[model samples]
Target: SLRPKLSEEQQRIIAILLDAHHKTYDPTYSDFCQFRPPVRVNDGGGSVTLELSQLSMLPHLADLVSYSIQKVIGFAKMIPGFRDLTSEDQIVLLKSSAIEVIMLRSNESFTMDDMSWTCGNQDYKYRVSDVTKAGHSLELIEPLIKFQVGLKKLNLHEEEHVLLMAICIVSPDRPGVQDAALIEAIQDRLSNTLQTYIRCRHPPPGSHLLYAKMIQKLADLRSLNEEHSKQYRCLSFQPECSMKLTPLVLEVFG
Candidate 1:
């Protein structure tokens, strides 16, 4: 399984996402739960609603999130142009964007159908909220489920996903980034890598949209996390779903 036959380009892409994830990561239960949970596609009873928490793990989850982003920035140094930025500028570029980057990459934890998220052994599971909920306008859950569906449907290879990550890292406009021309130049370079990456697949021009779609996906991802901040508080109001939050559990969600 470690050696699937891949084209040269595929191998290049794989190396980036693969090396970064493993080198910067440590194994935890959440990392092991990628298999699909047993459930029918139409099963309405699949998700356990959130009414959360056991502690101030919200703060801890934020802390671990920060920790992982620092690691990502560290690994990102391996990419060309990444090291060219001023140290302050490099952190500025990858800092806040880490949430969305992780959000997309973490799709491995969700079922193909978005039915559940597993964090421990095969049986330990959770779902933040269903598409339907009381007093909830269903705003937050809708985009997340849709984003889940869109990313999975794309069925991006590890390389393709990693390439997307690289492009994101070199974003031209992160609030305090210095030298607009240089960063934009780097952005175009990474974009070309992704564009050619698609040409290798050759499709009805729909494939041509891959690069832009990925950019938009990042936009959508940040929006989802933005909305998540607002809706997560709904958990505090409902105390009965009794969802116990912990550093690990919140880390899984974050």
Candidate 2:
């Protein structure tokens, strides 16, 4: 394998993931670092026994993987140490982070070659096909008044599709419902889903209010259409009924 040597950032990210996994699963485990193997070794001694004690506590491995990747990306973006690196170095730093992103968002393992993309920003050289696929899907709904309005209110231009997807997953078009009810439903659904997903991956005290506010911009768009007003056009995008299907459509451009 032509895997690049783990950089300081990469090592730090792996440590963060291991530490998080340990703290969440096994606080009393003797040595948490041991679980994060840099290189697998085969011992000559036969009869190696692996313990399932820590593994059983993690119910959703996919969520863990996804959350870990998200944390790494967040850390890189926010941490000064990571931000100091050159763009090329930053791209290398993102190799592991990108792998985890695709795994979590796609809920499957995608190869490095399969994940290639042309960078929209000159700062990065790589891009992923997943992003283009997602863009096409979003383009289908772009004509809807609700979509345009929500995108405008959120100040979400071309680069904020992930946030847009989050909005869409929580708030889809409702058919002939009262404006207040529709807005509330979207807010409630988004808040709950974001809370659940965030907590599952990073178990801290939850914030429904914050999540509510984040998607409020999108929910506000629902109110733009007056029931009797002929100026507002009906949204052609149908309501999304499945939570499982939500992540499959998310695309991240490099």
Candidate 3:
């Protein structure tokens, strides 16, 4: 492989990653919003069996999640060396890390003050109550929100956030992955690029440990992933629940 100057290579990688990110994600509202008004989950403190209405937000959330997964797939393909991996290994990495990528990306739309995610308009915000009614319980929603809160507090640049996502997908230790060393090398470059970018772009004191903290967030994602699967399995087992999910959702989470 031919080598470019270190600065030039880092810039190319960041530009490519950012382009992939912008192509896939649009924070503003879109045509899909006209199909329904903002969904509001009632805050009544009551518990009962999983009623259909309680799970109302799920389909919308699932739709968005599936969309994010597609974005993740596109972004992964753009990462340097990602397409060079065996097809089976690419599938494995995406299947394992899609949810984590979505979670990391959630900072884009999440609101710390209200603790909600705004879809496109003011009325389209989704709260924890909304998610719980969608079939996720406090066990998962709590940690997920806490993670978003912490990540937002970090005040990461758009570049750092997207680079972290690339790092997440290029991970080597995921189950069933072949060519661990090759993947690791890709991840190493991403990690080094991230560190170098941070030093160049961010002020000294705060950024010194930013890379380490970002890695810690990846560790946190493992627990969230486990909890997410547990809930997803339960929801999928229910009548009419699995049916609403897109084929991609079923393929990834099923």
lDDT of 2 by residue, 2-85 (tens): 323444644454354344333332223233233222221232231112111112111222233334455445534543234344
Local distance difference test, per candidate? 0.58, 0.31, 0.83
Distance from true location, Cα of 127 in model 2, Å: 26
Against the true structure, what is each candidate's TM-score?
0.65, 0.20, 0.92
Sort every candidate by TM-score, greatest first. Answer: 3, 1, 2
Tell me the alpha-carbon RMSD of every candidate.
Answer: 8.0, 22.1, 3.4
RMSD over all Cα atoms, model 1? 8.0
Pairs that collide in candidate 3 are none
Against the hidden true structure, what lDDT does model 1 obtain? 0.58
* True-vs-predicted CA distance for residue 103, candidate 1, Å: 0.9
Off by more than 4 A, model 1: 1-18, 25-67, 122-124, 129-138, 202-208, 228-254
Per residue, candidate 1 scores C-alpha lDDT tens digits across 22-141 of 676554645323322322123244333321222222332343444556566766786667778788777677764666766665565667543664445544443543223222335776
TM-score of 2: 0.20
222 Cα displacement, candidate 3 (Å): 0.9
Q: In model 2, which regions exceed 4 Å deviation?
A: 1-173, 176-191, 197-208, 225-254
lDDT of 3 by residue, 1-254 (tens): 22233488888999999998998887674744643233545547734264354566676777878878988999899999899899999999999999999999888989887888877655567787777767778889899999999998888988999999999999999999999999999999899889888777777576768988999999999999999999888887678887566789999998
For model 3, the local distance difference test gives 0.83
